[PDB]
């Protein structure tokens, strides 16, 4: 997916990233799933360990928290949808060790 070549700037704290850092990434399906935006990743104050997948839905999930100020829950179905984006991403990553027990052994 990411990490082609040549980080030109001298920016440490690797926010100057190739596209976006995954957990490990990709590996198989899909081999490239891109990410979101990076001009607003640094403009809007979004900390590290948050430049992973399902980010633009989270940037909008965090919009209605401020946009509904005396509120206890902005949209409770959206937290179940950001988690469904998260959990389906994680189960997509859970297919590594079934592949690793299969593909790495002799055949």
**Interface with another protein (CB under 8 A), residue from 5, 6, 8, 72:** 72
* Residue 13 found at the interface with another protein (CB under 8 A): yes
User: Residue 60: how many CB atoms within 10 A of its CB?
Assistant: 12
CB neighbours of 38 closer than 8 A, spacing ≥ 6? 17, 19, 20
Please tell me whether residue 17 adopts helix, strand or coil conformation: coil
Q: Considering only residues 2, 19, 57, 62, which one is a binding residue for another protein as defined by CB under 8 A?
A: 62
- Is residue 15 near another protein by the rule CB under 8 A? yes
Question: Can you spell out the DSSP letters for 64-98?
Answer: HHHSSTT-S-S-HHHHHHHHHHHHHHHHHHTTHHH
Among 8, 77, 104, 107, binds another protein (CB under 8 A): 104
For another protein, the binding residues (CB under 8 A) are 11-16, 26-28, 31, 40, 42-47, 49-50, 52, 59-60, 62-63, 65-72, 80, 83-84, 86-87, 90-91, 94-95, 97-105
């Amino acid at each position: 997916a990411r990490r082609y070549l040549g980080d030109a700037s001298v920016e440490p704290d690797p926010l100057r990233m190739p596209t976006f850092p995954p957990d490990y990434g990709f590996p198989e399906r899909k081999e490239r799933e891109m990410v979101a935006t990076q001009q607003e990743m640094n403009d809007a104050q979004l900390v590290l360990q948050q430049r992973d997948y399902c980010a633009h839905y989270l940037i909008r999930f965090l919009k209605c928290k401020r946009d509904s100020f005396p509120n206890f829950l902005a949209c409770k179905h959206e937290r179940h949808d950001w988690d469904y984006c998260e959990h389906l991403d994680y189960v997509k990553r859970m297919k590594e060790f079934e592949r690793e027990r299969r593909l790495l052994q002799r055949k």
